[PDB]
Design a protein around this nucleic acid. Structure first.
Lengths: 259, 167
RNA sequence: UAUAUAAUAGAAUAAGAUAAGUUUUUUUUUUUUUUUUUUUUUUUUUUUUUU
RNA sequence: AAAAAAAAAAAAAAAAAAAAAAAAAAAUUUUUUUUUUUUUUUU
């Protein structure tokens, strides 16, 4: 019998201080979030639209995904037409963490990410990972082996539709580039050469700093896959970054990940 | 489960009578509740159980004290040594109980006829603490009537005002 | 003519009960029996007409 | 004595409705991978 404003106030207080919490206080936090979860579950039909996303984030950051709160995520799949592309991108990862992520929900999800005038790296990464997971969703060796490829071709279709606009976005770090390229390669999505040029130029400019400053980081494995990706896609993408990575590996400026 | 098996119950009751001394707080809180629910009464066994629980009055947790008191109250088997021993203990644990458990304990105390402020003062505070759940329990809507009949309006003006109110 | 220095190693291996946080049609098909209504066929009785 | 028409009773077949009784199956393939921080308030 906790009041509607009380749960919101407590959740907002316990959420915004999470970034730097002391260790020995974490466990107690979770108990506060579990002693009063059932009231949230029954009130699930009364929360405001952004409050749903806020509550889901507050529960997720505390590594907690109880089943009693599963209806809330369901509501998000129904009212997805009101959120901004940023909120939709966050909702994609939230849904994936809630086991709610299916084919149809992502199929309806990608459009809002598409509607943005200028893409941002969070939306691109969320779209790529969601597309890959939903490609893993469809089963060839199963009871519905009649429409596997007709679904995979559609998924690749959207994949191309989001890939053709990838040159507009800034890439904060190499791992984002690695994730996007890994999805593209393992899913066999064609990308325009202009987006490849922009991606590889940004990667070259970013990787210049660590090598030239001889310290802060990029693991040797990461350089291996980046060199291999360019070698597969051709030297003309960045005819300088080829010898640049080769020299960087020759000097041994990139230590191993387990080192 | 809710299954009646009499013949087995008589043998178990006699065996428990033979082994009364070995009972713990959990064992008494289970046996007395089951015997009260099932209707099979043994006078000597219940006298021995109450006398034994008199000495073990300190070992009851939140569940055991309330359940034993309520089961004894409904059975109309009210020893006095057990009455005082269990009633005095209520002040220590009163913070831990829940609304329904406090209501049941209060009804058992009203049937116990103690009427001592030292024992009764924290129970009413806790009842006021959970008064929303206290007055929203249909299984016991008639259980508050005997309590408030025994104590009367001259005892707790706030609780009486809330009782008279619609809710 | 002074009051002060301090450093060596080894092992791979498993126990087991805390009085807890749901509930939102009920229905379809097949078979048997009884009752009611309609249609068709056979038998009996009565009335009318013709030979 | 024969034929036709009408009414009543009995038997059989078909259709519809109501009530009562009986029966309904199963074969391990479910999901994982963010740097996310946008609730609002006089506690």
């Amino acid at each position: 019998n906790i009041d509607m404003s009380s749960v919101k106030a407590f959740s907002t207080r316990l959420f915004k201080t999470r970034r730097g919490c002391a260790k020995e206080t974490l466990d107690i936090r979770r108990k506060v979030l579990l002693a009063m979860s059932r009231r949230v579950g029954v009130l699930a039909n009364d929360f405001d639209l952004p409050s749903l996303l806020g509550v889901l984030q507050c529960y997720t950051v505390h590594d907690l995904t109880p089943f009693h709160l599963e209806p809330l995520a369901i509501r998000a799949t129904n009212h997805v037409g009101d959120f901004t592309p940023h909120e939709c991108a966050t909702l994609a990862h939230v849904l994936r963490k809630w086991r709610t992520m299916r084919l149809e929900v992502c199929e309806r999800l990608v459009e809002r990410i598409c509607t943005s005038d200028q893409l941002t790296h969070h939306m691109a990464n969320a779209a790529m990972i969601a597309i890959r997971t939903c490609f893993n969703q469809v089963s060839d060796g199963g009871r519905n082996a009649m429409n596997a490829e007709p679904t995979r071709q559609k998924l690749r279709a959207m994949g191309e539709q989001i890939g053709c606009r990838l040159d507009e976005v800034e890439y904060p770090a190499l791992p984002v580039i690695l994730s996007i390229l890994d999805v593209v390669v393992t899913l066999k999505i064609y990308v325009p050469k202009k987006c490849l040029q922009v991606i590889f130029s940004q990667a070259n400019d970013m990787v210049a700093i660590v090598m030239e400053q001889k310290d802060d980081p990029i693991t040797a494995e990461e350089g291996r896959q980046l060199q291999a990706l360019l070698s597969h896609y051709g030297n003309d993408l960045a005819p300088e970054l080829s010898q640049r990575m080769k020299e960087a590996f020759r000097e041994g400026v990139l230590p191993d990940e387990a080192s | 489960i809710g299954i009646n098996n009499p013949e087995l119950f008589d043998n178990l009751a006699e065996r428990a009578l033979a082994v009364v001394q070995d009972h713990d707080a959990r064992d008494i809180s289970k046996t007395v509740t089951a015997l009260a629910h099932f209707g099979l009464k043994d006078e000597e066994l219940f006298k021995r159980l109450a006398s034994h629980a008199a000495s073990i009055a300190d070992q009851f947790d939140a569940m055991g004290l309330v359940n034993t008191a309520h089961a004894f109250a409904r059975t109309n088997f009210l020893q006095q040594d057990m009455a005082v021993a269990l009633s005095e203990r209520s002040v220590y644990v009163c913070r831990l109980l829940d609304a329904g458990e406090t209501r049941r304990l209060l009804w058992a105390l009203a049937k116990f006829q103690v009427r001592d402020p030292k024992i009764l003062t924290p129970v009413f505070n806790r009842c006021l603490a959970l008064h929303y759940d206290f007055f929203a329990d249909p299984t016991g809507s008639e259980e508050i009537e005997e309590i408030f009949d025994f104590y009367g309006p001259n005892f707790c003006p706030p609780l009486y005002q809330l009782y008279i109110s619609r809710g």
